[PDB]
Scaffold this active site. Sequence first.
Site, short mmCIF file in Angstrom:
data_model
loop_
_atom_site.label_atom_id
_atom_site.label_comp_id
_atom_site.label_asym_id
_atom_site.label_seq_id
_atom_site.Cartn_x
_atom_site.Cartn_y
_atom_site.Cartn_z
N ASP A 1 0.77 -1.24 0.00
CA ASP A 1 0.00 0.00 0.00
C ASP A 1 0.81 1.31 0.00
OD1 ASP A 1 -1.96 1.98 0.35
OD2 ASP A 1 -1.90 1.74 2.52
N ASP B 1 -1.91 5.62 -5.42
CA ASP B 1 -2.14 4.66 -4.35
C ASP B 1 -2.44 3.23 -4.77
OD1 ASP B 1 -2.84 3.27 -2.09
OD2 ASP B 1 -4.79 4.29 -1.86
C1 LIG Z 1 -9.88 2.40 1.98
N1 LIG Z 1 -8.74 1.60 1.48
C2 LIG Z 1 -7.85 2.15 0.55
O1 LIG Z 1 -6.92 1.50 0.14
C3 LIG Z 1 -8.03 3.55 0.04
C4 LIG Z 1 -7.03 4.50 0.73
N2 LIG Z 1 -6.40 3.88 1.93
C5 LIG Z 1 -7.08 4.00 3.27
C6 LIG Z 1 -6.38 3.18 4.34
C7 LIG Z 1 -6.99 2.96 5.57
C8 LIG Z 1 -6.31 2.19 6.57
C9 LIG Z 1 -6.96 1.95 7.91
O2 LIG Z 1 -6.41 2.38 8.91
C10 LIG Z 1 -8.27 1.20 8.03
C11 LIG Z 1 -8.87 1.04 9.32
C12 LIG Z 1 -10.10 0.36 9.45
C13 LIG Z 1 -10.73 -0.18 8.30
C14 LIG Z 1 -10.15 -0.03 7.03
C15 LIG Z 1 -8.92 0.66 6.88
C16 LIG Z 1 -5.00 1.65 6.30
C17 LIG Z 1 -4.39 1.88 5.07
C18 LIG Z 1 -5.06 2.65 4.07
N3 LIG Z 1 -4.46 2.88 2.88
C19 LIG Z 1 -5.15 3.22 1.80
N4 LIG Z 1 -4.64 2.93 0.55
C20 LIG Z 1 -8.56 0.21 2.00
C21 LIG Z 1 -8.29 -0.80 0.84
C22 LIG Z 1 -7.99 -2.20 1.39
C23 LIG Z 1 -6.78 -2.14 2.34
C24 LIG Z 1 -7.13 -1.24 3.54
C25 LIG Z 1 -7.40 0.19 3.04
#
Ligand SMILES: CN(C(=O)CCN1Cc2cc(C(=O)c3ccccc3)ccc2N=C1N)C1CCCCC1
Length: 388
Positions: A35, A231
Site C-alpha cells: 500500500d 495509491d
Molecule cells: C480504503 N482503502 C484504501 O486503500 C483507500 C485508501 N487507503 C485507506 C487506508 C486505511 C487504513 C486503515 O487504517 C483502516 C482502518 C479500518 C478499516 C479499514 C482501513 C489503512 C491503510 C489505508 N491505505 C489506503 N490505501 C482500504 C483498501 C484495502 C486495504 C485497507 C485500506
Amino acid sequence: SFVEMVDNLRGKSGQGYYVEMTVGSPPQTLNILVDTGSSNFAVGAAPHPFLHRYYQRQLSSTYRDLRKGVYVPYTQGKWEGELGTDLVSIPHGPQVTVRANIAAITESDKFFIQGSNWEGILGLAYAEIARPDDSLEPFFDSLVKQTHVPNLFSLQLCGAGFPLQQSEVLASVGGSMIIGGIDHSLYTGSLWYTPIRREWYYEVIIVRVEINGQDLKMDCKEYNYDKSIVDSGTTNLRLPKKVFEAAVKSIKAASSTEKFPDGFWLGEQLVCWQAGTTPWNIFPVISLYLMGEVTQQSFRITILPQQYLRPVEDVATSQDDCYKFAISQSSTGTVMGAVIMEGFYVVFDRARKRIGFAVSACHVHDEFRTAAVEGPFVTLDMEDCGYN
Ligand SMILES: CN(C(=O)CCN1Cc2cc(C(=O)c3ccccc3)ccc2N=C1N)C1CCCCC1
C-alpha cells in the site's frame, strides 16, 4: 535484471495486491498488502475470523515490546494495536534482514477483508502520515538505512486478465514490486518522470484531462482539489466531485451508441456482453497530463476501457462477460488507483523525489489500441494547479 523479484505480487486488485514476508525468529510467514497509500507496517497479531494466520510475538526470540499503544480509525472502522519491533524479510525480494517497527494489531473493525488472503499491510509512504506520529519510522526507511538497497522501488500491477477468485489467487500471479531497482523487462518505450510535490503521500500534480482527445477543460487546480496521490491500495481512479461528473458525462456521450443504467456509472450495477463481444471500441480512452521535471514541460499517460471497466464474476456466473465501471468520485482529492497503475510500470524514485510512468509490458489491450505515455507538451499554467 531483477528475475528474483519479478512476479512477487498476488491477490486481487479489487481486494489489493500483496507480497510474501516473514517476521520474527524463527521466521513467521505472512501475506502483506502493498500500500503506497499509507506508512505503517501493521500485521494481525491475534486471531480473527478472516485471518488464516497471524503474528505470534510470544514465539519470537527477537521480538521487542515498545510498550506504546496505537489507535487508527478510518471509515466507520479502525484497527487497534501494540507497537513493538522485530526482524523482517522478503523471500522473493532483496536478500536482507532488517529490524522494523511493527504495529501488532489486536482488534479491528472493517480492516481485514474477507477473501483477500493477506494478513497485514506494508505502508510505503513517508513517516509524515505515520501513526501515532512521524517518529515511528516506516519500513522502507529502515530497510534503506540498514542495508545498501537503493532508495527506490517500482511497481507493475498486471491485474491478471479475466475475473478471478480467492482460489484463482494462488494460481495466477498479479504483478511485481522491484525493490531498489528498475526492471527493463516490465515496460516498453520511455520512462517519464513527474515531481513529488510533498513527501507525505505520493502527491503529484495533474495539469490536463482528456477523454478521447477532448479536453475536459477545467481549471487545472480543480483536478488536484485537495490533493492528487498515487495509491496501490486503491482499486479505482478517484476524482473530485466536479471532475468526476464532467468525466462521466464526456464518457457517457462518447459511448452513446449504447445506453447504460445510471446505476452503472454510479458503480452500483454492472453490465454484461455475450462472451467475447465486449464492445471496447465504443468506450473512450482516458488521459491525465502530469507535470514534467523540466519547466513548462509535461507528458501524459493514457488508459483504455480495459483498465477502467473491471471484470467481475457474473451474479449467476453465466456465459456472459460482465463489467463494473471503476471510476468513482472523491472528496479527499484525486487517487490514482489500480485502474491507472495497471496500465503502467510505476517507479517510486524517492532518492530523486520523483515518480515515473512507462507503458506496462503486461497491460491489457486488444490489437487496435494500447495504453500510452507520451511527451513533452507545453500547456502553460501548471504549478498553479497545486491546491493549498
Ligand atoms: C480504503 N482503502 C484504501 O486503500 C483507500 C485508501 N487507503 C485507506 C487506508 C486505511 C487504513 C486503515 O487504517 C483502516 C482502518 C479500518 C478499516 C479499514 C482501513 C489503512 C491503510 C489505508 N491505505 C489506503 N490505501 C482500504 C483498501 C484495502 C486495504 C485497507 C485500506
